[PDB]
Write a protein that binds this ligand. Structure first.
Ligand SMILES: O=C(O)CNC(=O)C(=O)O
Ligand SMILES: [Co+2]
Length: 228
């Protein structure tokens, strides 16, 4: 079913109805006028960040190249393969860019310290896929450019998601959400979920340990805030 959308909810309403019970929600009217929303474009990103080295996930492999090279090879025209500048602390690397975002006020409801919040960039073409997995902190995923299809499964449903059987990968599902092998993973079919298309200016709250799967529908840039 669709993730609820709420316009600028109070801190206490967000706390009581979403944060404490661990329920996803999309926050509207919160990040929609951050400077990134109007400023970020391929040209702006090239100008500010083009010469800097970033990690890129290809396919599968992991490599390093400049932001300019990433755009040239994996974003524009007709890329050979899907590449994704995923899960990278770009704003620590480039303080000028950090000026264009801010910490959501709702993070103050956490028990953690503000300067321990991990801020990651997720920048890539249409068609990037982050397979179903769970993270160990709360997340506000802020959509800046393009749209993402997102599927969410509660931690209560872990038994239907067939986690990998190693410590390193136990927070990742073995299932391909959008084309599941139901002969091998029959329990997956029945597991309930939420989904949404997250659009520019919207923030998705992904509760701590909620399983999430993410596919970019367009050229996309998201910023995640991992907080406690
Ligand atoms: O945006 C993506 O492709 C995936 N994002 C996450 O898993 C996250 O923000 O924790
Ligand atoms: Co994640």
């Amino acid at each position: 079913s669709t993730v609820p959308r709420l316009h600028r909810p109070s801190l206490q309403h967000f706390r009581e109805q979403f944060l404490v019970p661990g329920r996803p929600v999309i926050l509207k009217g919160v990040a929609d006028h951050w400077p990134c929303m109007q400023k970020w474009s391929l040209e702006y990103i090239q100008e500010i960040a083009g010469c800097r080295t970033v990690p890129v996930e290809v396919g599968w492999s992991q490599t390093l190249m400049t932001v300019n090279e990433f755009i040239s090879k994996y974003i524009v025209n007709e890329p050979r393969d899907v590449g994704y500048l995923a899960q990278h602390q770009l704003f620590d690397q480039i303080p000028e860019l950090k000026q264009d975002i801010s910490i959501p006020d709702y993070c103050s409801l956490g028990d953690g310290e503000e300067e321990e919040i991990t801020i990651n960039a997720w920048f890539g073409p249409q068609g990037t896929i982050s397979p179903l997995h769970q993270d160990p902190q709360q997340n506000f995923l802020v959509q800046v450019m393009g749209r993402k299809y997102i599927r969410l499964y509660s931690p209560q449903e872990s038994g239907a998601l067939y986690p990998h059987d190693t410590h390193l990968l136990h927070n990742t599902s073995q299932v391909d959400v959008e084309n599941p092998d139901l002969e091998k993973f029959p329990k997956f079919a029945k597991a309930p979920f939420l989904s949404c298309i997250l659009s520019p200016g919207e923030i998705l709250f992904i509760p701590v340990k909620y399983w999430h799967y993410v596919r970019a529908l367009d050229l996309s840039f998201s910023v995640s805030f991992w907080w406690s």
